Ligand binder design. Structure first.
Ligand SMILES: O=C1CN2C[C@H](N1)c1ccccc1S2(=O)=O
Length: 283
């Protein structure tokens, strides 16, 4: 079926939970043996969210190459994304090592450091120009260059230096700051505006390594971001845009990381975002 009318048909019939459970039943199951090794316990935020072995990002290190991060490679859309958990106190150096080694231009953050009164990720970037951060375990230096605070999101320019070679690179930090503590946003308009700002920066384009996208677990909000982006790109590429099937795209993405889209409300919000986004694109 088309999307917008499949949408109204699920709303009127109140069957979002059943649609979402079908997706959960049909989703791929692949091994995640490296994630579960005892030496990696303090590298995982949640025991039930792990990268598959076949698609995990490897650190360029001989001691321990493990990080909780996955490469989502979308072949028809010609887009790639790295989806990862919010960094832990003992993995902030690994996180920036990955950004460096994979040649990413941008980092997309969809959570606040504290939500619901608990810590959802480490404070992994510097908050003041004159107070830079040094990660001694991976030999990197990180400096805040500029910050632009808007009503729904903040954009930061950061300098990452490999202290071993003295090479430097400019990294863009795109921080969506207004996702509610409970539920999903009422309108997709500010999320779409944010997606378009990431696109306009070049951070999603083939002349760079894959964008790094995270929330707390790196599957819910993060899944919503890449699902909406890929669906909108396919609608621009195909002769028949009504052929884009959001449930099929989501199952393709779940071949590369488990659990993408965590609730039926997140699934409905993804539909809404793609539907509204397709109208603004045209033309
Ligand atoms: O509260 C935490 C802090 N760490 C990351 C994660 N959650 C965890 C989970 C199991 C054992 C140890 C750890 S940790 O490394 O202390």
């Amino acid at each position: 079926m088309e999307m917008e009318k499949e949408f109204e048909q699920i709303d009127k019939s109140g069957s979002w939970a059943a649609i979402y459970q079908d997706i959960r039943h049909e989703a791929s199951d692949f091994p995640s043996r490296v994630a579960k090794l005892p030496k990696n316990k303090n590298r995982n935020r949640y025991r039930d969210v792990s990268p598959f072995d076949h698609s995990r990002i490897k650190l360029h290190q001989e001691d321990n190459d493990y990080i909780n991060a996955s490469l989502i490679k979308m072949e028809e859309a010609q887009r790639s994304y790295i989806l990862t958990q919010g960094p832990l106190p003992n993995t902030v150096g690994h996180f920036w090592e990955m950004v460096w080694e994979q040649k990413s231009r941008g980092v997309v953050m969809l959570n606040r450091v504290m939500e619901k009164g608990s810590l959802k990720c480490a404070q992994y970037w510097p908050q003041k120009e004159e107070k830079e951060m040094i990660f001694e375990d991976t030999n990197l230096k990180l400096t805040l260059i500029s910050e632009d605070i808007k009503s729904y999101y903040t954009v930061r320019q950061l300098e990452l230096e490999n202290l071993t070679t003295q090479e430097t690179r400019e990294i863009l930090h795109f921080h969506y700051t207004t996702w509610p503590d409970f539920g999903v946003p009422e309108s997709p308009a500010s999320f779409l505006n944010f997606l378009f700002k990431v696109r306009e920066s070049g951070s999603l384009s083939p002349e760079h390594g894959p964008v790094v996208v995270h929330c707390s677990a790196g599957i819910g909000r993060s899944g919503t971001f890449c699902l909406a982006d890929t669906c909108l790109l396919l609608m621009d590429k195909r002769k028949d845009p009504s052929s884009v099937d959001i449930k099929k795209v989501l199952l393709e993405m779940r071949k590369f990381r488990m659990g993408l889209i965590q609730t039926a409300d997140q699934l409905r919000f993804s539909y809404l975002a793609v539907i509204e986004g397709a109208k603004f694109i045209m033309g």
